[PDB]
Amino acid sequence: MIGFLTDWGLKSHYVGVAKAVIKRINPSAEIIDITHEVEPFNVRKASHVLYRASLDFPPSTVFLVVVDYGVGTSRKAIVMKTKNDQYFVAPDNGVLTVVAEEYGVAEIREIENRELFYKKNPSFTFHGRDIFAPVAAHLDMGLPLERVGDRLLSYEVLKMRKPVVENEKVIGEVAIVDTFGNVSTNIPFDLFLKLSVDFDDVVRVRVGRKEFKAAVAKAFGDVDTGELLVHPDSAGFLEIAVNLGDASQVLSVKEGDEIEICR
Amino acid sequence: MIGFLTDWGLKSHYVGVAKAVIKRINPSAEIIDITHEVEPFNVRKASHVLYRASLDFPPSTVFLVVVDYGVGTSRKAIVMKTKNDQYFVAPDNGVLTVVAEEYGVAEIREIENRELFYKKNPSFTFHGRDIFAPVAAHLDMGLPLERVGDRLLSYEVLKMRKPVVEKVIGEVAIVDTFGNVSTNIPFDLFLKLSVDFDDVVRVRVGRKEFKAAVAKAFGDVDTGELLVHPDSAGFLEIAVNLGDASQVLSVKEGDEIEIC
Amino acid sequence: MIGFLTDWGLKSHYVGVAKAVIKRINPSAEIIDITHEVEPFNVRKASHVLYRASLDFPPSTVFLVVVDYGVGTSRKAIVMKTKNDQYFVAPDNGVLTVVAEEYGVAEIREIENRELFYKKNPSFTFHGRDIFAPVAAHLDMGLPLERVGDRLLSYEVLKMRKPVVEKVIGEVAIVDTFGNVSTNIPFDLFLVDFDDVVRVRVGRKEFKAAVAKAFGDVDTGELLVHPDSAGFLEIAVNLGDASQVLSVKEGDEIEICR
Ligand SMILES: Nc1ncnc2c1ncn2[C@@H]1O[C@H](CO)[C@@H](O)[C@H]1O
Ligand SMILES: Nc1ncnc2c1ncn2[C@@H]1O[C@H](CO)[C@@H](O)[C@H]1O
Ligand SMILES: Nc1ncnc2c1ncn2[C@@H]1O[C@H](CO)[C@@H](O)[C@H]1O
Known part of the structure; x- marks a missing residue:
């Protein structure tokens, strides 16, 4: 094909x-x-x-x-x-x-x-x-x-700044914003899993000068409607989503923007 | 398939x-x-x-x-x-x-x-x-x-609101690319209102009321005019000839509609 | 098919x-x-x-x-x-x-x-x-x-107005997703030569544009006149949106002078 x-x-x-x-x-x-x-x-x-x-x-x-x-x-x-x-x-x-x-x-x-x-x-x-x-x-x-x-x-x-794990956090960039407004990064969820974090934990998502708290979850419905969540997208990358909402709007981010996720 | x-x-x-x-x-x-x-x-x-x-x-x-x-x-x-x-x-x-x-x-x-x-x-x-x-x-x-x-x-x-007759009352189900507003009202159920093609009915959406002609094809009315007719699936649809009904009626899907 | x-x-x-x-x-x-x-x-x-x-x-x-x-x-x-x-x-x-x-x-x-x-x-x-x-x-x-x-x-x-040559005149036929402005003017008729700078008239405003083969033949953000994939004269902004820059829409009259 x-x-x-x-x-x-x-x-x-x-x-x-x-x-x-x-x-x-x-x-x-x-x-x-x-x-x-x-x-x-x-x-x-x-x-x-x-x-x-x-x-x-x-x-x-x-x-x-x-x-x-x-x-x-x-x-x-x-x-x-x-x-x-x-x-x-x-x-x-x-x-x-x-x-x-x-x-x-x-x-x-x-x-x-x-x-x-x-x-x-x-x-x-x-x-x-x-x-x-x-x-x-x-x-x-x-x-x-x-x-x-x-x-x-x-x-x-x-030229791309490879996502690395450094001092309790992972640094990367927004790779794709989909139809739903889900924000997928270039950070492998596996790499993120080396920060010794697990589902149900809460991490900090930093975009520019803002900082948000986000629950690490498996499914969108694992948090209340309108709440932020960090999860692995369908390709194995760390993605930020808002349950039944638009994460790109909430975070006010676009593709290419630097993103940091602290333990 | x-x-x-x-x-x-x-x-x-x-x-x-x-x-x-x-x-x-x-x-x-x-x-x-x-x-x-x-x-x-x-x-x-x-x-x-x-x-x-x-x-x-x-x-x-x-x-x-x-x-x-x-x-x-x-x-x-x-x-x-x-x-x-x-x-x-x-x-x-x-x-x-x-x-x-x-x-x-x-x-x-x-x-x-x-x-x-x-x-x-x-x-x-x-x-x-x-x-x-x-x-x-x-x-x-x-x-x-x-x-x-x-x-x-x-x-x-x-949970849905089954369309009934007593005038007809229903809901906007689909607004297509052209802005045509299709309801969940079977066009046959509407015909059981002693209505006929060429007749002018009243479309009630929200708190507004419009005059609409019962026609078969968009071109059966002057350009920009409202019409009520059966869409390709047998449902009553409201449209504006060479226009956008959803914009004129300022209506969206889920919206309750009334035809007197 | x-x-x-x-x-x-x-x-x-x-x-x-x-x-x-x-x-x-x-x-x-x-x-x-x-x-x-x-x-x-x-x-x-x-x-x-x-x-x-x-x-x-x-x-x-x-x-x-x-x-x-x-x-x-x-x-x-x-x-x-x-x-x-x-x-x-x-x-x-x-x-x-x-x-x-x-x-x-x-x-x-x-x-x-x-x-x-x-x-x-x-x-x-x-x-x-x-x-x-x-x-x-x-x-x-x-x-x-x-x-x-x-x-x-x-x-x-x-009925359609046929483009001519007298500087050539025509109309915008299609504006694509990139904002490139394709006219009804066959690039053959138009053929001035590549590399020359021509004038693009869209009503009251005039723009200068290079006659090129590739978008990249001009600097980023610059205007070029070239043949599109169908052989029609098209106006484009390298890495930009000509329809926006020229503020033109399909049907609009377009003129090109030496
Ligand atoms: N942010 C989200 N919140 C809730 N559901 C979503 C979200 N993003 C995608 N989906 C659902 O995921 C499904 C595909 O797995 C889609 O049908 C879509 O409705
Ligand atoms: N509201 C309308 N007024 C006039 N023509 C329409 C309208 N809605 C759909 N059409 C035409 O119906 C055709 C499909 O049967 C389309 O090509 C479209 O141009
Ligand atoms: N105005 C333009 N400037 C630069 N590249 C363009 C322009 N228009 C189309 N292209 C490129 O032409 C390619 C197809 O030949 C597309 O992949 C597109 O990126």
């Missing part, structure tokens, strides 16, 4: 034309949209969403990831193979930073085989349709990776 | 990983999204959307319904088979109220067979992915109902 | 039931959503989106186009085949204006064969589900065009 992730939006016809190109190449291709609502050009956000979603896709899955503000420039178009046997077709702009770091890099190829393109002369600003989609389509069809082009020894990496 | 309905939104990756899990259990599963934009936690809205959508799905359809604010709590995870031969995989929180009342209940099973789960250790807040989705996939693929778990004799029901 | 375009939105269950209907007629039907977020009743916007998307769909593609404010009225329901071998199932309200003009019309049939319907008695306001969807499904299965109904020798046309 092909996992599809972009910042194109479902309002425009861009997603549909890319799917048409894929289906023209392989009528039997299975395309699963991860999301097409990544905020415009937000590669940092996309890198996180990609990793978390990839955890639920099987080995051999080909991911079409296109959040490409540098489309048409000298930035490289690449295909990465992670040590967990998954494939990623994307621009070399750092969007593959998290999967590369979490799964390990097995091999990286630059897309040079023009025979895999949808058009002889790709549009200057829509490589997603003319280069990335068809390449993902061919790979998902059995095309050997080596046929995409020559290997690369490096790839662009997004 | 599988009818998918949630309050997860299409912006998050939640819907995609759920479909991936389903596709992993059954590569040829046909998944049709009813909607994933149900307002967060709004089980009442979902209960109506579910029923109206189900009317166009064939018998044997397995519906995956997940608007589950109680995920991870003691609330039951169930599978309901209605008398019209449709199956519903959902939390026991009242979201299946309308399909239960309209189609009647044939059987109810509590999801207990852990071998039907996606992961050995289900997440505390994403049963949609770890329990409901895979169970819906297995069911849509043949799995006998008895393989789900023990039977249940009752299910949580959403 | 079927290209699906409407103004129904993805929030409502309408799109879903329409797809269920297509699938019941043909379980193997391949449905590709072009968009369901066309502004309500905006047939003009839909006509441009339909054409631009259709350029990337193969011949023999069946397009289900339903932006039908006149649903339930005397407006005709039709099936149009264009000379580029694509089929369009839609209301006769001008939504097919652009594909008809750009590709040329091969034939038009009024939908009269009721055996192609979803139900004997179609709803008054959801022909998308009861008439258009099933018809598109059948055509996609190989149903001969002559089996749809009788031929029509005309169709409703949305």
Whole structure:
């Protein structure tokens, strides 16, 4: 199957034309949209969403990831193979930073085989349709990776301050704010569990100059309606939520904001 | 096939990983999204959307319904088979109220067979992915109902105000993209008011009253005018031709409406 | 395959039931959503989106186009085949204006064969589900065009001002999610050369913009004029929102001077 992730939006016809190109190449291709609502050009956000979603896709899955503000420039178009046997077709702009770091890099190829393109002369600003989609389509069809082009020894990496445990607390950043307003950080709940904390404990969540108390719980309903809670999200990350409410509003936080959780 | 309905939104990756899990259990599963934009936690809205959508799905359809604010709590995870031969995989929180009342209940099973789960250790807040989705996939693929778990004799029901005639009185059930206001009032029940097409009735919402023409199509009235008619599911719906009824009437779902 | 375009939105269950209907007629039907977020009743916007998307769909593609404010009225329901071998199932309200003009019309049939319907008695306001969807499904299965109904020798046309060159002038056709402003001006006509700086006039205000190939060819936040993925001249702000910066909306007149 092909996992599809972009910042194109479902309002425009861009997603549909890319799917048409894929289906023209392989009528039997299975395309699963991860999301097409990544905020415009937000590669940092996309890198996180990609990793978390990839955890639920099987080995051999080909991911079409296109959040490409540098489309048409000298930035490289690449295909990465992670040590967990998954494939990623994307621009070399750092969007593959998290999967590369979490799964390990097995091999990286630059897309040079023009025979895999949808058009002889790709549009200057829509490589997603003319280069990335068809390449993902061919790979998902059995095309050997080596046929995409020559290997690369490096790839662009997004500078990120790794979440660490230091003196009774864990420091990190807000990675994703979902539809409910739940605030998921880049702090692994396992890392958080090294602060010798447990469900039913109460910890302090610090955002900027504010400090909130929050119960460590398993489910939203484990606290009264409207109350804050700290729990592990579906991908194993520490998330802050408000039962039947919006944590991003209560904390007044947005993606990228530094967040601290004291024991 | 599988009818998918949630309050997860299409912006998050939640819907995609759920479909991936389903596709992993059954590569040829046909998944049709009813909607994933149900307002967060709004089980009442979902209960109506579910029923109206189900009317166009064939018998044997397995519906995956997940608007589950109680995920991870003691609330039951169930599978309901209605008398019209449709199956519903959902939390026991009242979201299946309308399909239960309209189609009647044939059987109810509590999801207990852990071998039907996606992961050995289900997440505390994403049963949609770890329990409901895979169970819906297995069911849509043949799995006998008895393989789900023990039977249940009752299910949580959403308290509702059954629409009656005496004028007609009901509630706004769904406000769609266009702002059309669909009620829980069957258009047939309304016709038992000696009313007829072309007649002008009065719409009473809150403390305001409007004049509305009984018509068949939006274009049967001048642009911007209010009309009362049967929507695609047989329910009385109020709309503004080339306009937004919800804005004009300044009404929201759950709102009580009166037609004299 | 079927290209699906409407103004129904993805929030409502309408799109879903329409797809269920297509699938019941043909379980193997391949449905590709072009968009369901066309502004309500905006047939003009839909006509441009339909054409631009259709350029990337193969011949023999069946397009289900339903932006039908006149649903339930005397407006005709039709099936149009264009000379580029694509089929369009839609209301006769001008939504097919652009594909008809750009590709040329091969034939038009009024939908009269009721055996192609979803139900004997179609709803008054959801022909998308009861008439258009099933018809598109059948055509996609190989149903001969002559089996749809009788031929029509005309169709409703949305009058439109054609862009020119004298500096060139045109109108904003589509503003995408990024805020990029795509016009109805073919970038070929426009072709001045890349790297030159031109003037963009949007009513009373004027802006300077670089003619470039990639958004990144200018500095962050700067304006550029380039060909979009369909070949139309588009105005964009690198890493920004041109629609906001230019304070323009679809339908607005746009001028570009050397
Ligand atoms: N105005 C813009 N500035 C920079 N990048 C853009 C702009 N519009 C679209 N893109 C990028 O084009 C890519 C698709 O080719 C998208 O992933 C998007 O990030
Ligand atoms: N902050 C929250 N409070 C209560 N329920 C929630 C919250 N966030 C998500 N959910 C529920 O989790 C379910 C998915 O597991 C969704 O159907 C949603 O209703
Ligand atoms: N209030 C309304 N006025 C006019 N047309 C409408 C209204 N609501 C829905 N429609 C049309 O009904 C069609 C679907 O049957 C849609 O394409 C939409 O344009």
